[PDB]
């Protein structure tokens, strides 16, 4: 309680709730959810048609600088109409505050490639194109980064398995490196670790 429990903040939580409510009022066009968790970092959750407007408004307007970008990630979730989640994560220089800007999208509909307002997102956008498939219209160069050239599949999906569909070895028949269907030497014995007895009762969705 007084030791060993991480103490929560109050006034910073109040100010981030006020600021999220502020943003949500002053942009009625692209607002679905604003939320604050217990550790007080602001979350905004956005329809994917105002990405460059929200980032321009969150770069300027002079009561929110937020000049530092992080991570872009379109974190893959199944079961949904829109799998992929673009997650911007912004830090301000004059303010000491942290916002997450999460807009959602599906497997094929592109977004407007916000490299033109943040130059940091160029290699980030190329990388997340190579690993997911969230295509980026109005973008200079989409090459492949963190993958092999002849490899494809966008392998951070939940469809692409842990070991690949490709294997490389060498032969002296044609004096070069060739590919093969994969041949593991061990099973990768997967560990069933789904415990019973209601791990967290506070997060109970309404049962169907």
């Amino acid at each position: 309680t007084r030791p060993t429990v991480r103490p929560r903040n109050d006034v910073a939580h109040k100010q981030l709730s006020a600021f999220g409510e502020y943003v949500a009022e002053i942009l009625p066009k692209y607002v679905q959810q604003v939320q604050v968790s217990c550790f007080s970092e602001l979350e905004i959750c956005i329809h994917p048609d105002g990405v460059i407007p929200v980032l321009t408004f969150l770069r300027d307007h002079s009561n929110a600088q937020f000049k530092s970008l992080a991570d872009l990630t379109a974190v893959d979730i199944p079961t949904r109409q829109n799998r992929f989640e673009i997650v911007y994560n912004l830090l301000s220089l004059r303010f000491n505050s942290r916002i997450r800007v999460k807009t959602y999208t599906d497997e094929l509909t592109p977004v407007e490639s916000s490299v033109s307002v943040y130059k940091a997102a160029n290699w980030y956008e190329r990388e997340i194109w190579d690993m997911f498939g969230v295509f980026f219209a109005n973008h200079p160069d989409l090459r492949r980064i963190l993958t092999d050239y002849g490899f494809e599949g966008h392998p951070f999906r939940k469809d692409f398995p842990l070991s690949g569909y490709v294997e490389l070895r060498y032969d002296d028949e044609v004096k070069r490196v060739v590919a093969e269907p994969v041949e593991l030497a061990q099973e990768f014995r997967k560990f069933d670790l789904n415990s019973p007895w209601e791990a967290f009762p506070a997060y109970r969705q309404p049962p169907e």
Partner: protein
Amino acid sequence: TSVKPIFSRDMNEAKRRVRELYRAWYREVPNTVHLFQLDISVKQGRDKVREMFKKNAHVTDPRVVDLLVIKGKMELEETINVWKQRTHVMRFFHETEAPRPKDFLSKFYVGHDP
């Protein structure tokens, strides 16, 4: 499902962009097979190019056809540069057999297979 487009509004620009891609691949073969010092005739490489175009006959949606054109244009960038190598182009070829069968009798003797 009033989906945003990619490049084409219907199948017309889809066919036009993929035939422009195949035009670029036909005029892309001899420079690369003379530069990369391969072991294979120009006609065999061009026939595997047209075979890889023949593999995708069931592709219908304009988003998907445009995305195949995007993949082909990215690979033609990486082959008009020497970012790729001889290993990747010989990996497009399937020469080191792998003579893996298809007959049910040969799926039966060499078995544990569908």
